Swiss-Prot record, chain A:
It comes from Escherichia coli (strain K12). A motif (RPON box) lies at residues 73-81. This is RNA polymerase sigma-54 factor. The gene is rpoN. It comes from the Bacteria. Belongs to the sigma-54 factor family. Sigma factors are initiation factors that promote the attachment of RNA polymerase to specific initiation sites and are then released. This sigma factor is responsible for the expression of enzymes involved in arginine catabolism. The open complex (sigma-54 and core RNA polymerase) serves as the receptor for the receipt of the melting signal from the remotely bound activator protein GlnG(NtrC). The chain holds residues 382 to 476 of 477 of the full protein.
Curated annotation (Swiss-Prot), chain B:
The chain holds residues 1045 to 1094 of 1342 of the full protein. DNA-dependent RNA polymerase (RNAP) catalyzes the transcription of DNA into RNA using the four ribonucleoside triphosphates as substrates. Acetylated on several lysine residues in the presence of glucose. The gene is rpoB. Co-administration of salinamide and rifampicin or salinamide and myxopyronin suppresses the emergence of resistance to both antibiotics. Disulfide bonds: none annotated. It comes from the Bacteria. Belongs to the RNA polymerase beta chain family. This is DNA-directed RNA polymerase subunit beta.
Amino acid sequence: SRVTTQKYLHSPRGIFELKYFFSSHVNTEGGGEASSTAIRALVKKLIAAENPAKPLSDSKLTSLLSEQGIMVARRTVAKYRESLSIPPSNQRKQL
Amino acid sequence: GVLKIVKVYLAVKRRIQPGDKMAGRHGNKGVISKINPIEDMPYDENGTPV
DNA sequence: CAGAAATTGGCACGAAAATTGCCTTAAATACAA
DNA sequence: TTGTATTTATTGCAATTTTCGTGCCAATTTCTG
């Protein structure tokens, strides 16, 4: 806990906090676990490719994720989206 | 800390004009002062200008 | 028109995870009696 | 011979706080009859 405080690591991808690698988890199909920092990337990817006329809601993201066996509740998806600073589904539609 | 480098090359053709410096092989340099039209240059019996 | 279905987020759970303040000496060693 | 002042070795425990995912439900949007 003490060592990893405010020390940076330089990977070819970029510069990280060395505490960015410690993350939470949710259950998965098959008895495994999936990290929250990967579910955030998956949610960002899914939102960044939806139909602009009909944006995906939190239920339509929970159901979409629960076909690769990710087993995430809707409220957790909402928490991840609000952590990513993405407006709700009714505020992303456009003509 | 460097991710990508992009280099762009531009090619331009420079013509001759007054102020450009010309010379020769015997140490006789000079600067162009005028671009004279053809019908003003001196010509010989056959009409070939200089 | 309007009741109903759908969406969203504040607040609340237990459990897990992460922090933070301390036992503010015990045992090997060389020296002296 | 032994008792002792001297010198290393010691980078962990155990409370206490904070954060986790997810359910309840009221307020706001959207939708179909």
